Structures are given as C-alpha cells and as structure tokens.
C-alpha cells in the first residue's frame, strides 16, 4: 500500500501547486510601482548600552517601549532601561548557554532558554525584592531556540527536537505540542491576536499553526536553506521569512504563496533577524556581514544601512510604538536607532 | 533627579558586580569534549571525577578546568557549535576498538570557528586494539595500509591518518595513547593546556 500512499501524496502536492499557481494573477512588484519611494532613511545611533562582557544572542522589548531585556552568553539576563541607559536588573542564569529571551506583555515575567533543553520563567515582581525562578519547564529533547509569551499563564516554545509546544506556566506541562517539521525549528512568531503562530525550521519550510486545535494549517516553501528568522506583518495577514540563503521572502496567509524576494547579488551573508516597522512599510533585516539593511517592503528596494557593529548582529527588534530600533551583535553592545 | 539618583547608584553598583563576576570567571580554563558514541568520553570524564549539556569542573595544579560535553544533542551541530568559539582546546576521543570518526574530525578541524583552537587527541582501549589486531588485520578499516600487522605500527598509522586532516599552519594537534587503566590523562591535559596558553598569549602580543 506504500505505492498508493506515495501516489496520493504526489497528486496532492500537484493539486496544491496548481491551485497556488492559478491564483497568481499579478505580483506585488507590478502593483506597487506607482507609489513614491520612501527615499533615504538615514538613522543615527541614539544610545549605546555597554554592560555585557560576552556575546549577545537575544533582545526583547517590553510593552511600554522603554524597557528591554538582553540574554547574553555570560550567563546574565540584564533588563535595560533605554531612556537613561541604566541597568535595572541582573538575573544570573543556571545554564550560561542561552539563545532566546522573552518579555511578558504584562511585564511581570521574563523567559529564557538555550542548550539546557529547559525554559526558565523568572518573576520580576516578587515581594522579597530579588528575582526568583518561578518555573523550569522540561520536556524538549533538543535545544530550545525560541520562546514567546501568549499571556501570563501560557508560553509557546520552539525547540530543536523538530517539535513546538504550548505550555501552562502553572502546572508546567505541555498542554499542546505541534509536529510536522522534519528538522530543527529555530524561529517563532506569535500573531497580534495571539490565536495563530508560524515557525521556520531548518528544513527550509515555514508552517502555520493554530494554537487552539493544535493542527497545522498551511505550509510555505521557497527557501533553499535553513530559515533563521520569522515575523508577522502588523496587520497579521502576512509574514516575512529570513533564511541563510541571503534572501528575505514575503508570504501571504490568504493567498498562500510568495510575494517578494528581498535579495541583492552583492549580499552573501545570511540573515539572523527580520522585523518590521509599525506601519509595515520597512523591513529591517540583520545580516551576518556586520550590518543591518532597511528594505522597502512594497518595492524590494534598500533604503539605508545601519552600519556600526564590529561583529555579526544576532538580534533585532523594534518598539511597539515604532519610535526606536534595537540591534544586538556579538560585539557585546546593543544599539538604539532613530 | 529626585529618586533617579538612587537608580543611578543601583545601576553603578550592579555594573561593578558584573565586572567583578566577569573577572572571577575569566580565570577558568574551558575545554570542549567531542567524539563518537561510546568512544570513551564518559570513561575519561569520570576518571577525572566531579539529556542536555553536561558540565564538569575540577582543579588540577592551580588550574580550574571546565569540560563541556555536548553528546546529548541529537540535532544538527552547525546550529550551536559557534557557542564554543572561545574554548582553549578540543578534546577529541577515538575508540581504537572499532572510519566513522575520521569524517567528524575532518569536519571539526577545518571549521571556520576553530581555525586557531588546538585539538588534543586521546586514543583509548589499547588492550582491546591489540587483541583485535591479533584476531583481525588492521587493514579492514583502511584498505590502503600496506604494513606490518602489529600494534606499534598500526597506532602510528592511525595517528598519521587523523593528523593529516589539519590544513592550517597556525595550530597544533597533540596526540596520546591510553590503556583505560592509567591516571596520566590529567597530566597530559595539563601539559597541553599550558603549551596552548603560552602560544595564545605570545600570539596576542605579536611576539609570535
């Protein structure tokens, strides 16, 4: 019965390909040609937070757009006040090999994770003043690559065991687990309505998930290498994917295909982080060539260079109000641009 | 500037504590464990005492070591191997009882992140290798080995095969043989680490 199953799979793939090809009546490049270009976007460094001593792997903003949390490899998660460039907290970590961080939307908890296969939840509003480890989630076989906060009780994580899981920070059990990727998952983006999320794995494929039913909805392809970043459009109807093939690609949830390829023949270093602007007009992508490019999301054109890092940029993120852009590189310095 | 002064004082205090912790941590010596499954990594990490990453620390002659074992990661190595760019050396262990490890050594030796870090080679199960040599020829693994069927020459050929994978002139590959019943592993690692430390410090100053 293996032959029948293989034939059915091939037929289904052909049907999906034909259906997706029929709906491509026009492209974004043929539609947004008559809009005036954004011109030059010359941003200058506003602050330079020099606290760490080793590589920086992650950086996340709070909901108030003033506080940021950096999880460096020195085994320290320092919470940052951007306006005054002050250190507000210093949380030592049990495992120094950390490669993700998350700031709760309420602002009471901070998540962390890495090669310990375990997601750690720290409580920033303890009665005793200091910060304590509220919970230590276990259940992943491979390394935890990302973690995002749905709310104060549920946290969704992506790990290198080819599976993503939904957690309950109260009982510390996997309420729902997501399967289907054939390889390591190294990115994750929760939707603005916190009902959907998408993951980009190392098998060169992006998938759309439903948090409630726990079933895969759509599969996006088009990359020739591992996907290192993912991020939603502000409207939640589209998302951007950066890969190790030096290309950023834009997909549509409803149209279920690709829309634009953000590539330059001169660029060869991979992308480590993709993030948008508040209006969804710019797409700041972090390359390994020690600089971050600002792409025009509607015309596939460069609009400026955020040069200034001595090493590869490992994390990028914009504030909720869109008043600042953050870049964190291996040079142990985090920068605020405006 | 009413209670922002106290915030500034707190930030300065915790910055000072960060600096002190960094200086305290910078003294330690960091090694990295690598090898095939059941190659003998567990034996030589347990003989020195004390599913994620397993870290083992011990002090030997005024040096604090930190052996980082990453054998539990059943995923792609290329997505986390850059975490150890600053390790002083790589301890690579080969089980002489058994070609499935030569490819791994070749991959790890020419890696862009490890173009300057030295590699320390330990070979285990000497008695087992001798028994197998008596029982079976050593040319089954290496068909091109035209030489005597003895332990002494087989070990030399194995060392040559593993050492020929180096391409960078600015690194060294120390070698050693083990019999699973000796305690000289600590002294060997100490001597190799002192040599590597001398080399790195001389190269930093430009005198190398």
């Amino acid at each position: 019965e293996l032959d029948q199953l293989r034939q059915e799979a091939e037929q289904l793939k052909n049907q999906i390909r034909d259906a997706r090809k029929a709906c491509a009546d026009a492209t974004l490049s043929q539609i947004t040609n008559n809009i005036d270009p954004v011109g030059r976007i010359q941003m200058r460094t506003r602050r330079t937070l020099r606290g760490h001593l080793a590589k920086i792997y992650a950086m996340h903003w709070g909901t108030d757009s003033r506080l940021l949390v950096s999880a460096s490899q020195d085994g320290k998660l320092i919470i940052w006040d951007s306006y005054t460039t002050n250190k507000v907290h210093a949380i030592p970590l049990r495992s120094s090999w950390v490669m993700t961080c998350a700031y709760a939307p309420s602002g009471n908890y901070v998540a962390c994770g890495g090669l310990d296969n375990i997601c750690s939840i720290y409580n920033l509003k303890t009665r005793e003043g200091n910060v304590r480890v509220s919970r230590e989630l276990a259940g992943h076989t491979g390394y935890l690559s990302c973690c995002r906060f749905l709310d104060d009780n549920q946290i969704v994580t992506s790990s290198g065991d080819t599976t993503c899981a939904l957690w309950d920070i109260e009982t510390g059990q996997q309420t729902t687990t997501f399967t289907g990727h054939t390889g390591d998952v190294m990115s994750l983006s929760l939707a603005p309505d916190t009902r959907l999320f998408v993951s980009g794995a190392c098998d060169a494929s992006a998938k759309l998930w439903d948090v409630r039913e726990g079933m895969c909805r759509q599969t996006f392809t088009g990359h020739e290498s591992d996907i290192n970043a993912i991020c939603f459009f502000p409207n939640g109807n589209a998302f951007a994917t950066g890969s190790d093939d030096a290309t950023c690609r834009l997909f549509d949830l409803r149209a279920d295909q690709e829309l634009m390829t953000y590539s330059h023949d001169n660029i060869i270093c991979g992308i480590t982080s993709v993030s948008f602007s508040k209006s969804g007009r710019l797409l700041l992508a972090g390359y390994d060539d020690f600089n971050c490019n600002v792409w025009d999301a509607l015309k596939a054109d460069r609009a400026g260079v955020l040069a200034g890092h001595d090493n590869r940029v490992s994390c990028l993120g914009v504030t909720d109000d869109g008043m600042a852009v953050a870049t964190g590189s291996w040079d142990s310095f985090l920068k605020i641009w405006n | 500037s009413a209670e922002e002064r106290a915030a500034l004082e707190r930030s300065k205090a915790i910055e000072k504590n960060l600096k002190e912790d960094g200086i305290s941590a910078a003294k330690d010596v960091k090694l990295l464990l690598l090898g095939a499954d059941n190659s003998g990594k567990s034996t030589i990490v347990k003989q020195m005492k004390i599913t994620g990453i397993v870290e083992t620390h011990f002090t030997f002659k005024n040096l604090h070591f930190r052996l980082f074992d990453v054998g539990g990661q059943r995923s792609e190595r290329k997505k986390w191997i850059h975490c150890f760019e600053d390790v002083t050396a790589i301890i690579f262990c080969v089980d002489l009882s058994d070609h499935e490890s030569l490819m791994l050594f070749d991959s790890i030796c020419n890696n862009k992140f490890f173009i300057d870090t030295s590699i320390i080679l330990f070979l285990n199960k000497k008695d087992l290798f001798g028994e197998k040599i008596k029982k079976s020829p050593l040319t089954i693994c290496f068909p091109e080995y035209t030489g005597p069927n003895t332990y002494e020459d087989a070990a030399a050929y194995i060392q040559a095969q593993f050492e020929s994978k180096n391409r960078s002139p600015n690194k060294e590959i120390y070698c050693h043989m083990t019999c699973a019943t000796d305690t000289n592993n600590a002294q060997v690692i100490f001597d190799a680490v002192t040599d590597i430390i001398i080399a790195n410090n001389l190269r930093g100053c430009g005198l190398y």
Partner: single-chain antibody
Amino acid sequence: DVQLVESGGGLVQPGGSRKLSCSASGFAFSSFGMHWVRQAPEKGLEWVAYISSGSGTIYYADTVKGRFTISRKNTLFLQMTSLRSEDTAMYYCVRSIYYYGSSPFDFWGQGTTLTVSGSDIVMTQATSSVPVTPGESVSISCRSSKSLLHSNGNTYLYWFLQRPGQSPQLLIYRMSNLASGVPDRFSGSGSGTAFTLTISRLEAEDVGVYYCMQHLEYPLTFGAGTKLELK
C-alpha cells in the same frame, strides 16, 4: 513573610545616648534603602534619617543633623546622641527600593517608643477632620509650596494610610499608581500643585488618618494629616 521588628526605646534622661536597631527578615535587606520615620505623641510623621544601599548616600534632617548617625548581617543601626525633649516620638522602620517602576515606602515596621523627660516644600492638609458614613464617597486634599511635576513627567506625591492602632501602609505611590494589595476602590489624582485621593464605596476598615508626602527633594516633609473618622 517580610518582617521588621525593632527595639531600643524606653525612658531616657536628657543628654543620654540610646541605640535603636531594626531587625529585618524575609527580604533582601542588602539591596533595600532603609529610612527612619518618627511620630510624636500627638503630632504627625516627620522624617529622621535615610541610608542608601551599600552605605553610599546618607541624609539627615535639619533638626537631626550632627547629633544622630545611622549605620548598617541584616540589621540597621541608628546611633542617637544628645537626646533633647523634642525627640519624644515613636520611631518606625521603613524600607524602599528605587528603580524604574519601583514602589518606595511599601512596608512599615511595628515601631518603637522613645520617651525623654528654608527650601522645604511645605505641605498643608487643610481639613483637620472629615466625618464620613459607610458607602459614601469622600475626598482627601493636599497641596505643595512648589511644583511636584518634574521635567520627566512623574509626580512625586505619596499617600499613606495609618489605621487606628497600626503601622502606616502605602496606598498610592507616584500620585497615580496603586500599591500592591490595596483594594481598587482607592484612586488618586491631581495636577502640579493640588492633589486628591478619592475613596469610593467606603468600608469599615478604611477608617483612619491619611497622610501626604513629597519626594521631589530631601528632606521629605509630610502633611498635618486628615482624620477620616466614622460618621
């Protein structure tokens, strides 16, 4: 739980020397700024001394400076020299943390009793006493001699509640925010110079005396106090 028990009072001859010590347990005392607040047998609260975390900055009141010294094992010491007749009060222990979004003056100790045989922002609580019935909304007013809206946009008015026979509790900090555990019925407002704390759906446990404090610059001068007596 957090606990601040302290002792060192009694009856002292004038010119004698006493030592009050504050025992702390249940919280990271090494990272909190401890103050000293006293209450005369009839008058209101008056700030005494403050010692920063790490013994960096120490402040003393104008009527305290020179004679009294404070020092810090989880114990806070306050050396007391040249006791005068005006020093009779009940000395309290208060902790405080200062960072972005912090809640200063959150916890207050049980206090100890001691008996002895020009740029200050003066604050006035115009109403000495306010009679109010259960279930009816009231209002507590305060003022200041200088603007308390700093350039950074944070008003520094702290409201305190002193229940009858109990240590004061922090109810509203930064003139708009509500402290931890405080019921939602309380709400405070104001602008620039005049401030108001609105109590809606009065209950039996809210009866007491309410206080006004400033934090724009040392010394921290309190108000006279408004007595929200029953009926």
